[PDB]
Structure 1
């Protein structure tokens, strides 16, 4: 029902970024067929059809190749050489379908000294300077969950690659291979810090920068109730609006960007915010441009008016799940279909006419 209605996707069951890129294609209307090893409660596996095949057997190889022959996109997320050894490498796939967008999701990439090494999100962002930049300066770096490598710089770059190559396909009539390494994607994800490094606007020192928690106007504060607000008041008119709401006289404060007095500045904002609870500050800074919001825990998210009003989440046995993103005015995505029982691979083949 969304913009990708009609798009045929073969996903080889993996973990992390592959199934997340595959979910997003399904979210937006694609026909995604997932092949697993010979009814799921993982909501990530929404908007698929699940089939099963031993890719190491002659029948399973044959069936999967017949499935790939009728597809637009193949997603795989194993080590380089794995699909090759199975007989499902790009050159074998090309033989039965040269319109195929062959999408390879890895952390290290297809080649290079580490391309055969095991790893996960934390490893990939450790090697490109990202992880070192995250957390408080007086402590060892903290992982930003797996948002940066696996998803932000992983699956999202796989999708761009995939859709980019489909655009190319319109003029050339041919697919190709998408080499999507989390180490690359995440670097492009963080290109802003690389730009700013070159002009003296970002330093290698952890938690001493504008957007890393070093700036008293770009950080969380703890309130009277042990809960938190986020302050994001970069621009001076926003910062001023923020001080107005706190009832602080600007003339009694250090300048916003005098870094030499940032501890003094923070101590004064800390005292201010500590004086009431989080919900007080949401009432105080209601419609304002102060860039002050409540830090909601996952469980409170569904009670937030802006979240509710725009239907950012829907309920699915177990709890809340995010609606497809982004939104489309003419071809709107549907609410995601729940994970369902495994179906017969043959049924899909007839459906796809193969």
Structure 2
């Protein structure tokens, strides 16, 4: 039902960014066929058809290629060379389908000294200054889950690459290869900090900047109940609204942007926030522009009115899952279809005509 209805995607079963990319394509209405090794409880495998094949066997290769001959996009996330050795590399795929967008999802990219090296998110963002910038300044860096390498700088760039290549295809008639490396995507993801560093607006000192926790107006605060609020009152008029809700006199406080006095400012803000519960502040600044919000655990999200009203989540069997994003006014996306039983690869070939 979404805008990608009609798009055919072959996904070679992998882990992390590749399956996430394929999910979003399916989310938006694509026809996604996932080939695995010979009913999943993994909600990420929503919006698929699962088929199986041994790609090291002559029959599996032949069946895979027939599928690929009829697809728009191929997603693979193995080490570079792996698809080549199977006979499913870009040059073999070209011979049967030169309209194909061949999307290669890696951490380190297709070439370079590290291209054959195992790794995970935390490694890809360790090499490009990202990790070093995350966490409190008095302690070692903390990983921002696998949100920045695997997804924000990984699958999301694979998706952009795929969709941009589909635009180009309109006039060239041809596909090509998209090399989406997490080490690259994540760097463009953090381009604002590269831009800020060049102008004296960001330092390499962890935890001492405007957006990393260093600013008392841009951080979390612990409340009376041991729960937290988030404060993001960057603009002076938002900051002023924040001080108001807390019952603090601005004249009695250091100026907002006097970094010399930030520890003094933070102590006053700490004392304020610590005097009531999280839900008290939630109520104080419910409709304000104070940029103060309650910090909800996953298990609490379902109770928040803005989350409910907008149907950001849906109940699948066993728990809430996020609905497709972003939203489309005319070709809206469906509620995702749960994972289903594996189906016969030949049946999909009939459906597609391979």
- TM-score range for the pair, normalised by the shorter chain length: over 0.9
Aligned equivalents of 2:280, 2:194: Cα separation in 1 = 38
Show structure 1 runs of 4+ deviating over 6 A. Answer: none
Aligned equivalents of 1:196, 1:125: Cα separation in 2 = 19
Deviation at 1:293, TM superposition (A): 0.1
Secondary structure of 2:177's aligned partner: strand
Aligned equivalents of 1:162, 1:52: Cα separation in 2 = 24
Aligned equivalents of 1:16, 1:338: Cα separation in 2 = 18
Deviation at 1:318, TM superposition (A): 1.1
Secondary structure of 2:240's aligned partner: helix
Give matches, 1:249-328, under 5 Å: 249-328=249-328
Match status 1:153 vs 2:150: no
Deviation at 1:331, TM superposition (A): 0.3
Deviation at 1:315, TM superposition (A): 0.4
Secondary structure of 1:276's aligned partner: coil
Q: Deviations over 1:20-72 (max 9, x none)?
A: 00000000000000000010000000000000000000000000000000000
Aligned equivalents of 1:343, 1:96: Cα separation in 2 = 24
Residue 339 of structure 2 aligns with which residue? 339
Aligned equivalents of 2:111, 2:269: Cα separation in 1 = 50
Q: Deviations over 1:203-238 (max 9, x none)?
A: 000000000000000000000000000000000000
Q: Deviations over 1:262-285 (max 9, x none)?
A: 000000000000000000001100
Secondary structure of 2:71's aligned partner: coil
Give matches, 1:99-114, under 5 Å: 99-114=99-114
TM-score (norm 2): 1.00
Deviation at 1:303, TM superposition (A): 0.3
Aligned equivalents of 1:50, 1:286: Cα separation in 2 = 45
Aligned equivalents of 2:190, 2:284: Cα separation in 1 = 34
Secondary structure of 1:15's aligned partner: coil
Deviation at 1:327, TM superposition (A): 0.1
Aligned equivalents of 2:283, 2:47: Cα separation in 1 = 39
Residue 50 of structure 2 aligns with which residue? 50
Please, which runs of 5 or more residues in structure 2 have no aligned partner?
Answer: none
Secondary structure of 1:213's aligned partner: coil
Deviation at 1:194, TM superposition (A): 0.2
Aligned equivalents of 2:3, 2:160: Cα separation in 1 = 15
Aligned equivalents of 2:318, 2:133: Cα separation in 1 = 35
Deviation at 1:286, TM superposition (A): 1.3
Aligned equivalents of 1:158, 1:286: Cα separation in 2 = 38
Deviation at 1:287, TM superposition (A): 0.7
Please, which runs of 5 or more residues in structure 1 have no aligned partner?
Answer: none
Aligned equivalents of 1:141, 1:277: Cα separation in 2 = 29
Residue 214 of structure 1 aligns with which residue? 214
Secondary structure of 2:179's aligned partner: strand
Residue 165 of structure 2 aligns with which residue? 165
Aligned equivalents of 1:320, 1:180: Cα separation in 2 = 30
Q: Deviations over 1:302-335 (max 9, x none)?
A: 0000000000000011100000000000000000
Aligned equivalents of 1:107, 1:318: Cα separation in 2 = 32
Aligned equivalents of 1:196, 1:43: Cα separation in 2 = 38
Aligned equivalents of 1:230, 1:117: Cα separation in 2 = 38
Secondary structure of 2:321's aligned partner: strand
Secondary structure of 1:26's aligned partner: helix
Deviation at 1:353, TM superposition (A): 1.3
Secondary structure of 1:75's aligned partner: strand
Aligned equivalents of 2:268, 2:318: Cα separation in 1 = 43
Residue 190 of structure 1 aligns with which residue? 190
Q: Deviations over 1:124-168 (max 9, x none)?
A: 000000000000000000000000000000000000000000000
